[PDB]
């Protein structure tokens, strides 16, 4: 089986600073895409940020641009969320998803249990 | 409303023979798996494996669709598969298709939880 495994995430203050690492073990090849979902409580799941293999086809979703920053080992099956200025409204649990294309819920195969991150006001 | 992965099986899923055996293969299944009902679908290929080894393909190694979209996944291993294109005669309501019958690494779009295929890409 392939393992996802996330780290990183927990508490934080408003305005503050997060970073997520994700890593998946298992895999024979090197997934194009990997990128960072999102659910809050009482939610539908989010993309947040996806990145491919050689650094490329990078993408934000509106509501964190310019907050945050996806980076990837070249290629290697390894996603990172640099996370700034966050906020009561990106309180959620984060999910590092793999296999998909850009943040296609739907196109991605391989999901983690998550890394809650709330934000304190 | 019929599933993406239900209608994956019923255009490209023939688990129940191992191979093409008549030159009229595709002329009755392209009509059996409504593929002809409202225009003849101008390609299509059929794949002679058991589900399991097919739904197998989305663990197996992520590549590019030919569209450039990158949900797909080839087998590792040669599959057998028959291709139906249409004649240059086939005119709906009058289908008509050549078979050809192979042994190919297959190439699918997967999707959802369960991650199933949903679009037959390619072979090669």
């Given at each position: 089986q392939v393992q996802m495994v996330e780290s990183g995430g927990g508490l934080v203050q408003a305005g503050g600073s997060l970073r997520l690492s994700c890593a998946a073990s298992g895999?024979?090849?090197?997934?194009?895409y990997m990128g960072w979902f999102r659910q809050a409580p009482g939610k539908e799941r989010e993309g947040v940020a996806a990145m491919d293999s050689g650094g490329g086809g990078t993408l934000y979703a509106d509501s964190v641009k310019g907050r945050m920053t996806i980076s990837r080992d070249k290629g290697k099956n390894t996603v990172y969320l640099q996370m700034d200025?966050?906020?009561?409204?990106?309180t959620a649990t984060y999910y590092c998803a793999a296999?998909?294309?850009?943040?296609?819920?739907?196109?991605?195969?391989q999901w983690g249990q998550g890394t809650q991150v709330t934000v304190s006001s | 409303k019929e599933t993406a992965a239900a209608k994956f099986e019923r255009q490209?899923?023939?688990?129940?023979?191992?191979?093409?055996?008549?030159?009229n293969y595709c002329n009755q299944m392209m009509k059996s798996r409504n593929?002809?009902?409202?225009?003849?679908?101008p390609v299509n290929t059929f794949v002679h494996e058991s589900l399991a080894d097919v739904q197998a393909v989305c663990s197996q190694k992520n590549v590019a669709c030919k569209?450039?979209?990158?949900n797909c996944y080839q087998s590792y291993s040669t599959m057998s598969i028959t291709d139906c294109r249409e004649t240059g005669s086939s005119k709906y309501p009058n289908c008509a298709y050549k078979t050809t019958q192979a042994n190919k690494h297959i190439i699918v779009a997967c999707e959802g939880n369960p991650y199933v295929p949903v679009h037959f890409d390619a072979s090669v």
């Open positions: 895999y024979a090849y090197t997934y194009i200025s966050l906020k009561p409204e990106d296999g998909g294309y850009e943040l296609r819920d739907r196109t991605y195969g | 490209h899923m023939d688990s129940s023979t191992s191979a093409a055996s008549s030159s593929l002809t009902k409202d225009r003849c679908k569209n450039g979209q990158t």
